[PDB]
Write a protein that binds this DNA or RNA. Structure first.
Lengths: 369, 369, 369, 369
RNA sequence: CCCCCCCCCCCCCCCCCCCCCCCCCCCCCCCCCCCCCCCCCCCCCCCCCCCCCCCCCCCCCCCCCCCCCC
RNA sequence: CCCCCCCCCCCCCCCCCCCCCCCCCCCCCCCCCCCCCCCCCCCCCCCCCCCCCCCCCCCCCCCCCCCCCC
């Protein structure tokens, strides 16, 4: 029977990758600092001092946000995440200590952290800039409120909201989503961009881009922190904003699956073409694979999971071209920089999707009605 | 088959969030006072003294109501709630002690509580104001009744009724439901607003708004206290009022689901439009998700649960516009400040819902009858 | 039942027009000459003399061709045709006689016809021109053949072939099909355009246009002559050419019916639009009417039959626009000067018909396959 | 319903042509000789004298064969045929008479016919040539047999066999089938081409071509004579040869119908193409029309019947191209000078028909087997 | 990003039952005859036949993926 | 009372055909036998029986219809 001349390549590749009986273990290189719940207050203080500092220097904001996320997770869970990701990690204990230095010819008390990645001078200078900006702004408006201070419990979570936007745009492969990050961080968080002098979305976004590029394990740590944070029973409104912006990253890098479901929903006719119907077997194969994967598959491209390539639909040029055409016809493709590889099917689907709005729907009374 | 080109994104996101294998643990900052059953009588006395004090100062009423709720729960359950919500809490023991001070040049006996959040001066001044207001009102009417006193066992529960109204309106994101809270606290509790001189709904509502804004864990504590209180076998009539006002908050922030069920019930025709039928698959997805969640989902938006965004229907502009139009046509939309994002479907549904009252119903004898 | 809210207007109009119990009888004005079988040879001689005359004057060729057709029909059938068409006719007997005149100072014998419409001078001058052209061409090539002479039995039928082309293009309402007539008379009849010096398609076509414009009863006579000629058991090859060119006129003025059948055959999707399906009832009404009429309906527009307007499809703007779009997309519309009255449906159908050639066909596996 | 958007143009045209209520009547011009059964022996004698005359002059053989056919039919049936064909005929009586002339200075008795088309000198000279050729051949071989004489009763029927071959090739429109006529008259009738000195196929074929070109009514007369001859109960072997060669002309000019039936029989796949299936409705229309016509339709193109154009299949370019391709692939198209108007379908069908011989047949186990 | 409206609940009437009535009552041990069963003939098998025998390595192309908005 | 609007229609391209091909061809009479058919016994019926039988007139009331608008 010709019906059994078939090969389930996607499922077989998945079974090969999921049934490996040997494991690799990478070496991060530089030692990882693992803060615990103890220093969460101090890291939040540092984030607040960065936020209240106008004309601020955000060169180290990405690392400080990563430290805050790791302190929220806790040392045990951070270590367990790093092992489960397949890393050899030098767990570095983080504890708070005092440092005494004379600036302006006056003895001064600073409370800093033992971070191998972040030197004492940097934290001291962050405090100095924050203090003098606070002095100037207190002079210019008289009395402060808990709104204008580093002691707010959500100062770190605003920085992590910026990180969540960066994560949403990470799947583009470079810093091309920086403009989108800035635009969305101006739409969202506009009250904060009033309230905090140093909340500069572009600088923080660039810092997080840099830290994610240099340390790929921080992407894994941040994704699992975002999943753990989104699994809480509740929280403040800033944590709700972070959860909403983080789940905006679900399915990033897999827009074609959603647009294919959309093209099925609007019932585009060019799904009835000969070549599309030729590829439909493996297309349904891919969709069933995505469903069997389920929730974990939504962050494959952000995490650079090796099995991300199994979810691709560009390996079916005709179906992909029809899907892109339908997306462009419905007016939702935007600046999507993926290009069709069957221009004719793309144009036909685009035209039909455009007439799907002036000419509402097409019946199929043809053929017996 | 084109029927298997589908993705269950809502369910996959829920499974991802519910199957997390790492947890975060937040730090509240300031220490939490955890009163036990021992001081419930004293906290109720404090609430009664606040209530019988005319021209009262309600700056601290929200914290005192929170303390009363936590004392009703007990220290064990309050601590367990705070852990289950994912908080690091400094459990502060609350016990009663005496303080002696000379006011009016006379030695005076006061019995106060060891609360870190509430200083002794504040409790002393509350007692002073209550005592002199009691003296003045006793002078002006001769003899008091158990109706006019702080020893009533429901004085704290009236304050918690005001808190329940504030909770009902918390999902609006700000203090825009203050007018509704005042109106409902005048409709309900009018006998009390006679009986208690200091029962000022606006001041207590503002105090509870402030305490819920500053301490997001108090929202969790109060919601679980309200659920535990509503699980009792019975109580007084004020506790019944509190239970009725608290379950008025169930489903807050999710009005569109109820209005969609309503639009299905009145059988609005614009549910048969092309785009609405395109979105119906994911709409049924969302409704099945809400049902699988069940009872716990009714307080997701009040608690700022991260999975609250999964219940949204505004991600389907056509269905949402039809639902808003049907609600506006039936005359129940009120001042709902959500706006349609398909004006045409909104207007069509509104018009049909309006003719659903003069022109009772429409048969579908068209097509074969 | 809403299914019986229907009116069969086309069929009712046809029954009203076909069941009239009173008749009109028009008056042609000028007397009609009715030649019989006797003078068929002489009229064919006259046509041959016109054909062999180079640089000829074809002012009277249309009338002579009409006389030849009427002589082929016979006087009885010509009279019966004129009565059945509803005309009052002065039947004029045509017989041959001799006329003697002196040209070049020499007595000369001419044999002419008693035609009221055609004077003796005209026939004499036709003979003179033919004779001297024959003399010149005999001088220039030495000896003639039966190919180069007026005695050929098909000289009149060539002129009637030109008349048949003019009839094919008569439905345009004016002399706009003259170029098409000339082009087709050059493609066909090229051997004759060699063989006959005076076979000028444009002059003969203009003469036939003039005679059909002045005498509308000659259109009826010629159409019924063409039907009678095409009902013969056989004939020469020129008669076969005439029959082929005459049946090319069948269905002239009713191209939209054929193009609608074509759009049904290529299964254009825009036949499934809402408005097209609204009009489909009356469209099927018109097609059933055309079929009930049958063969006689193919010459309604040429004859200016009053019931020609009942076969129109432009009374359904959406279906007509779809049909024109399908015709233009398939590349067969040419210079058809009818214009769509629904531009959107026209463009949509044109686009789909164009993709019907690169993208062969579209299956309807959508909806359950 | 879209299924009733249809027009039966072929059948409607046939009904229009078959239901004409007026008739034309052509004039042959020159008078028709109508021999009766009386002079059949003399006309057969003339044909035999032409046949036994070596190096003969066949300028008049076509007319003599026509006279023999008309004498076999009889005067009554010849006249009735000419009327039924729609001709005005001057019936000329043919009778035998004697003419006396002195050749070689000697009185000589000749018995000739009163034929207006054939002068006495021609018959006399035919007899002279036959007599002297007979004398020379009798001298050269001594004694004659009934094989070598003009008195054989089939001498006229051999000439009519040559006429039958010419009729088979008449549908080509010119004298392009002359080579085929000569080849078939050499294959058949080779014993006669031994036996008769003047049986020159090319000269007789040219004479019959000429007479059929000049007198189109002789084609009708000969076709009906051949039908009447083929309706006899029996005859000689030469009459059987004539019947076989005459029914070889049945269906001449309609090869595409037979080749389409053939392409259906060999089950060519390109009959499943989209455009072919578009045209299949009108193709089946044409085939049903041909079957309804039946036997009379086999001589439409030979007789130049006006309804011959209704049997054409070239009005369906795709089906015609597939049919020509299948014919060329099977190796039976020969020098058929009709050309495809869809080269692609022609080539595809030709290729499949070629692989129909090395690769016997193709099953359709594809799709469920 | 999400969200945004309105809304305490309840309210009536109401005991139920009520009579009459013990049940049973007759007749009737069961069985009973005749009959042992079996009975013949018959070892089974018997031939022919080892099996195998050809041809044949397989492979060979192209291809990172992603990119929108929220 | 009813009615009340708008609206001529048409418009393109296109003669058709074209090849090959006589048919047939062998063998063959059929039949063949046997056979008359029938054959017996037998009349049928047979009794009893007239049928019917009573009671019974039927009916009984009320009630014109209609009414608007168009």
């Amino acid at each position: 029977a010709l019906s059994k001349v078939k090969l389930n390549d996607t499922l077989n590749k998945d079974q090969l990758l999921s049934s490996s009986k040997y494991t690799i273990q990478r070496s991060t290189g530089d030692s990882i600092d693992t803060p615990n719940y103890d220093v969460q207050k101090h890291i939040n203080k540092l984030c607040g001092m960065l936020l209240i500092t106008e004309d601020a220097n955000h060169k180290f904001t990405g690392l400080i946000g990563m430290l805050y996320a790791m302190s929220r997770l806790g040392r045990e869970d951070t270590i367990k995440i790093l092992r489960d990701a397949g890393y050899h990690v030098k767990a570095n204990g983080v504890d708070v200590t005092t440092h005494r230095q004379d600036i302006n010819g006056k003895e001064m008390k600073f409370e800093v952290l033992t971070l191998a990645s972040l030197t004492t001078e940097i934290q001291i200078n962050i405090e100095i800039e924050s203090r003098k900006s606070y002095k100037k702004m207190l002079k210019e408006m008289g009395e402060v409120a808990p709104e204008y201070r580093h002691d707010s419990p959500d100062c770190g979570m605003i920085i992590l909201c910026i990180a969540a936007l960066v994560i949403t745009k990470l799947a583009a492969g470079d810093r091309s989503g920086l403009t989108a990050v800035i635009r969305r961080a101006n739409n969202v968080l506009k009250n904060e961009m009033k309230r905090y002098k140093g909340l500069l979305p572009k600088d923080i976004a660039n810092s997080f881009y840099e830290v994610f590029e240099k340390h790929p394990h921080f992407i894994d740590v941040f994704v699992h922190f975002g999943i753990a944070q989104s699994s809480t029973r509740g929280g403040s409104r800033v944590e709700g904003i972070f959860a909403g912006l983080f789940m905006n990253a679900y399915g990033a890098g897999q827009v074609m699956l959603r647009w294919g479901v959309l093209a099925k929903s609007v019932k585009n006719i060019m799904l009835g073409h000969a070549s599309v119907q030729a590829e439909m077997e493996q297309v349904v194969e891919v969709y069933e694979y995505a469903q069997k994967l389920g929730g974990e598959a939504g962050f494959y491209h952000i995490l650079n999971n090796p099995k991300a390539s199994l979810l691709s639909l560009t390996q079916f040029p005709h179906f992909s071209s029809v899907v892109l055409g339908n997306a462009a016809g419905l007016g939702i493709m935007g600046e999507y920089r993926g290009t069709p590889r069957n221009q004719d099917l793309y144009d036909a689907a685009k035209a039909y999707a455009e007439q799907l709005k002036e000419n509402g729907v097409i019946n199929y009374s043809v053929l017996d009605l």
